[PDB]
Symmetry: C3
Subunit: 409 residues, 3 copies
Amino acid sequence: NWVLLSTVAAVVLGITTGVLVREHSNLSTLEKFYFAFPGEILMRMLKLIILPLIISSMITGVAALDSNVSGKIGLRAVVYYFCTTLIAVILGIVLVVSIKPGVTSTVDAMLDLIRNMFPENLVQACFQQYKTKREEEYKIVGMYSDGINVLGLIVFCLVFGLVIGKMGEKGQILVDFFNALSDATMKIVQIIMCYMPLGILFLIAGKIIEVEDWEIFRKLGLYMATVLTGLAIHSIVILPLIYFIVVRKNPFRFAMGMAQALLTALMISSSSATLPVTFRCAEENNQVDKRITRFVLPVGATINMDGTALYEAVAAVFIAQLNDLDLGIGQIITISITATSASIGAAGVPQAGLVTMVIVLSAVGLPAEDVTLIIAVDWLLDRFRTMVNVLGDAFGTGIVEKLSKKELE
Amino acid sequence: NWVLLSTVAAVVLGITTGVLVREHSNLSTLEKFYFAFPGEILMRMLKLIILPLIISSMITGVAALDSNVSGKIGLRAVVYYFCTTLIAVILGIVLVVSIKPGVTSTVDAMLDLIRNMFPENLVQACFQQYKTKREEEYKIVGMYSDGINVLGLIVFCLVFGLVIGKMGEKGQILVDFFNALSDATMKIVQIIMCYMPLGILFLIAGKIIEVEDWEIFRKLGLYMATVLTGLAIHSIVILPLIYFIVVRKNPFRFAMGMAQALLTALMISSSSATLPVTFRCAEENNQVDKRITRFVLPVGATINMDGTALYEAVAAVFIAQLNDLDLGIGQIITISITATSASIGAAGVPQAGLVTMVIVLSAVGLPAEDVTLIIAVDWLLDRFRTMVNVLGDAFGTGIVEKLSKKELE
Amino acid sequence: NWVLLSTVAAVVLGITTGVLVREHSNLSTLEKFYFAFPGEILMRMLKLIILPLIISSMITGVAALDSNVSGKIGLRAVVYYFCTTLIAVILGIVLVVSIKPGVTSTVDAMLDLIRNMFPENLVQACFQQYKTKREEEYKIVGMYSDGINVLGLIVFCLVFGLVIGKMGEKGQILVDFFNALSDATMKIVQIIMCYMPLGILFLIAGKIIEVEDWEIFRKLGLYMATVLTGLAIHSIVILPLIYFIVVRKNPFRFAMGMAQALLTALMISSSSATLPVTFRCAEENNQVDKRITRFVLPVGATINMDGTALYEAVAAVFIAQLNDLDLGIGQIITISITATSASIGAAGVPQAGLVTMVIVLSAVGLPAEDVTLIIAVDWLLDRFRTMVNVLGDAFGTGIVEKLSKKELE
Ligand SMILES: C[N+](C)(C)CCO
Ligand SMILES: C[N+](C)(C)CCO
Ligand SMILES: C[N+](C)(C)CCO
């Protein structure tokens, strides 16, 4: 594949250029800023595109989710993809606080989630964010600090996406305007990813120059041991339990029937690319009828956020812990809800692991140029994330036969 | 009706909760801020929607006003609905300064009306507002303070609405895009009004807690005696004179012929809901032909701002007087022109008295959470405002028979 | 013509009012600000419209440039209209620094061209601009100062215009939405130009009042001797050489064959108005086939920026030199690239010399009210600019017969 091979060949040459400058020359504090300029322009190019990508892919992802939730079968998969998303948020927050990869009020930060879901302006929500601060027996002021409001542009586009879906023929030009705006801002991300090999070369090399000790290669080992532990309690302990609670039919036999599509997800790392394969393995091996697989698998490519909350919401807390933030427990729930929501906006993006992380790091107020620690090993962890998304969707096929049995007639 | 009954039942339970907390417990200065948080989220939800509601309803209200002003009949109703709008602005400013409900340069503030009609940026006009200040033999600086520019987003959408109406078939996708955007942002205001009973419960109760003296129940009695005096010189003295100046046929006989539609407006408080009724009473009782009633009544549901300048531009000055502002005479004309213009944007909104007031209080730089004094008694005054809008439109039927008599052949 | 006669009659009455106030009365520092208020509102009206004019005319100018570059003929005119545009930028920068009309780091300002082509936000690019500053062995901070980012709204709309052109039928509603938005924001500029005679009357008169010495009538004579010298090395020395390098057929005979359309351009000063004439003189007199004139003349009305870089990028440096700026050499290339790019956005505007200058003066951070020095003599220099655009396009017809000879079969 091109986009995988070229990114690995730019991480290898990024470390090759990176140690042949710090151990072979000596740059100033200014010339280590001009050396990381082609990787600076990539971070401006990526933040440029997340505003028409959030707005267009949330409006069309939700206005096409209607008529894919027809009946009660499409409602008994929205409850399932919210019940295992909420457990994956709790499992991602617990595992990043217990392990703490990258080390050494709370009510006023949970009421800013609900304040930022409903902004006071839709144009200010594209570049500003409401943060409140207790001061003086106390009183409370609000500031509107900078940084994009991703939570309020997603709650509004989820409401605006439901309204124009149900409007019928009067709101067909609004679905057609944003379907074409979503196709046009996924062909610009394909143009940016033709520059992304050159940009991550000078982004990796600008980090190995400034790094003086190999402690950051240990915090990058405890990060892969928090993602591969979040994505191994979910595939072994959490999701085979949820199947066995309602469907008493041995969940380790269900996964062996899907072993052709689990092994295919380790080679592509894209859920919508092996979506023709997981259709072919579910019906023939597990003996499930086609009227419920065609109703939960198209909603399971928009709503299945089990893998994001264990990978991109552990990465975005690891970056925040890397900058010596204490974060409390109220700004961790702020991050893991912004990281889980931003993956619905970065829905079918080509390099959807890199783009989603630039959305959350720009939203929660972190340096987006710290994503180059994550894309060094993103090609290992995105393969295993979509093995959970394929296994999570396959258990979402065999669960809605059991709550929907009298509905099929 | 649901939206009336539920709002009265949330004002009654708002005062019931409000006196069973201040006279039964004791909250801190912080716990009186967390008690009014469900009413804070309503004020964020309302300010969220006034930006796509101003833009879409002004573009479609004006691009559909073309072909409803065909001939000279539709021009002799635009002059009439500007001549009685300007008298209602003068009558609303005089009555709120002479009575002063809620008590105890000028050239640089009239040149900021004309500066804010033509902003220097269309994206900055969505959240910022130009205020100029004389300083030092003097010189003049400009600041761009915050708060939405409603005047400049209405003057531009009035020009942009006329241009795409007259473009014909080349500008039909622009009328279709904003017709669907206006239908989609009136179905979101219907979703907000399903939360508005809960929000105004904690908004009323958060005001009765902090109020320690019943002087504010006297300033709320002088406010209803300024609206019901502005809307009783207009229906008795001003508008029956304007009929009798040009049409010498006893205006108190004209209103008795419309008594079925005046009494219907006291039960619905919506001009476009009794618009089928005022068609049926004008032609049969007053003997007016249908070629001029169908030409002045659709422009009389977009342009008839006689009732707004006596109700929502007396309320927005009463709120400004409540915060101990002196206002001069130049910032009163700023308010009553912003309040009269913002009711064309809040054109056919369900709760169009509450939404219009949040537009003007956010525009002229006032606390939008002070609208809860007004919605306590809005269900009394909005019935009597639309009785003036029905009587003002009925006299706008019997006036254009007299200036248009040779035009009908 | 109306728009020429009325503008000359407002420059004459502007100087007539201007010397009958300063030599016949005495105004304060405040009353010389209220006297130039009708010309202030014109500068707010002009800056109001450059945001939907840049966005709509760049998207439709580029999405219609596709299928006008079919084959290799339409590629051998994009190289020619970039090779003579880059020489006109170098000739405009050299001539405004050598003559310096209006008198008496660099790497951090060339890396801000590339930083401002790719902004971090599309809504902030409509009103804000990234300027970086070296400070402290040094480090580099970035600020986001105010003023519209014209470079980043043109690079994005050039990429977004190419993507929706090549999308075919899926991106036809996006071409139809911006074709109608571009027709609707050229009919608002025609409404503004009905006020522009009144606005430039009080704009000229507000400058002759404050001027106390006639040195500014000498710097306005060295400005016309830099534009008419830039547009006389291009028409005599630069462009007849580029023809004679590749096409050995005596370029002074080519221009005599186009003498009917050169003389017509001195009477209209519009390239797309004499575009039917330069078609009729190229084929009959110079004996060129119609298959290459119809392929380079529609791309030569969007891409031919030879005349802008010698007129509007010498004017925008002359205004910057007038305010006693030193500008280095890095902020001169910033101006002449912003002035050359902004003339693709002001593509077919009626008063396209006045509107283009308000775009660049607002972009590079200059007073837009200093354009009234330029529109005093714009009707002399815009005639001679389009004589170079007609001569530059005619030599762009006789050049693509020589590189395309085996392609025509
Ligand atoms: C299923 N994905 C996580 C890949 C996209 C939904 O946000
Ligand atoms: C006639 N109304 C006042 C109800 C709407 C026009 O703004
Ligand atoms: C050819 N013009 C310069 C007139 C427009 C292209 O920007």
